C-alpha cells in the first residue's frame, strides 16, 4: 500500500513543490578573482552542501520511501549530478548567457575557462537553460522532471520475483508523474497533439542532462586524481559509485 499511487495530479504537484530544497549560497568573495583550485572549491563545496538537502528532498518524493534502502542509495548515486545540473539549469533560465550556481555566484562562459576542460560542459548547461527558456518551462513541470530523473536514471541498472514488484512500482510512480505532466499541459490550453509533443520535448532533454552528467562525472574524477581541490567525503563516495 503506497500513498504515492493514490495522489491526484494536483496533489502530486503540491507534494513535489512543497518538497523543493532551498537555494544555497556559495562562499564566493568578489574581492579577489579565484584560481582554478579555489573556483572549483566553491563549486564542490556548494555541491556537497546541496547533496545533504537533496537526500532529504528525495525522501519526500512520492514513492521513494517505499523503496529499499539499498535501492534508494543506488538511485541517488546514479542521479545526484543530473539532479544538481537540472536545478542549476532551472535557476539560470532568467539569466541568459550565465549559470546561476548560487544567488551570489553568477558565471558566464568566459569565467568558466578558469577551470581546465570546464568550457564544453559550460556551453552544454547554457544550451539546456536556453532550451528551457525557449520552451517557457514551468516550475510545476520542472519538479516533475527532477523526480523523473531520480526514479529513472538508475531503474535499468538493478534477480528475484520480489525485485520485479519494486521495479514495477517505480515504473508505476513514473507513469503517475507522466499523467501529472499531461495534466499540467492540458490545463495550459494545449491540444492533445501539443501535449504529446511538449511531453516528448521535455523527456528528450533528460537525454542531454545524462550526457552532461556523464562528462561532468569524468571531469570530477579528473581533478580528484590531480589532488587539486579538496573533495568532501560524501562527494568522493558519490564519485566512487560511478567509477
Amino acid at each position: 500500500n503506497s500513498l504515492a499511487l493514490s495522489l491526484t495530479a494536483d496533489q502530486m504537484v503540491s507534494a513535489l513543490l512543497d518538497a523543493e530544497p532551498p537555494i544555497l549560497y556559495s562562499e564566493y568573495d568578489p574581492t579577489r578573482p579565484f584560481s582554478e583550485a579555489s573556483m572549483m572549491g566553491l563549486l564542490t563545496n556548494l555541491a556537497d552542501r546541496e547533496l545533504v538537502h537533496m537526500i532529504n528532498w528525495a525522501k519526500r518524493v512520492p514513492g521513494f520511501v517505499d523503496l529499499t534502502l539499498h535501492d534508494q542509495v543506488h538511485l541517488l548515486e546514479c542521479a545526484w549530478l543530473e539532479i544538481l545540473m537540472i536545478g542549476l539549469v532551472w535557476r539560470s533560465m532568467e539569466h541568459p548567457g550565465k549559470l546561476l550556481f548560487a544567488p551570489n555566484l553568477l558565471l558566464d562562459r568566459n569565467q568558466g575557462k578558469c577551470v581546465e576542460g570546464m568550457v564544453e560542459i559550460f556551453d552544454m548547461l547554457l544550451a539546456t537553460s536556453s532550451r528551457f527558456r525557449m520552451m517557457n518551462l514551468q516550475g510545476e513541470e520542472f519538479v516533475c522532471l527532477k523526480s523523473i530523473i531520480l526514479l529513472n536514471s538508475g531503474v535499468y541498472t538493478f534477480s528475484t520475483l520480489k525485485s520485479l514488484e519494486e521495479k514495477d512500482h517505480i515504473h508505476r510512480v513514473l507513469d503517475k508523474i507522466t499523467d501529472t505532466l499531461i495534466h499540467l499541459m492540458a490545463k495550459a490550453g494545449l491540444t492533445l497533439q501539443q501535449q504529446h509533443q511538449r511531453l516528448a520535448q521535455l523527456l528528450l532533454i533528460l537525454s542531454h542532462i545524462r550526457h552532461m552528467s556523464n562528462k561532468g562525472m569524468e571531469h570530477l574524477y579528473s581533478m580528484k586524481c590531480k589532488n587539486v581541490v579538496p573533495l568532501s567525503d560524501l562527494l568522493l563516495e558519490m564519485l566512487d559509485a560511478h567509477r
Partner: peptide
C-alpha cells in the same frame, strides 16, 4: 556509506 547513513538518518 555516508549516503546510506544520511538516508536512514532520523
Amino acid at each position: 556509506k555516508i549516503l546510506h547513513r544520511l538516508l536512514q538518518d532520523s
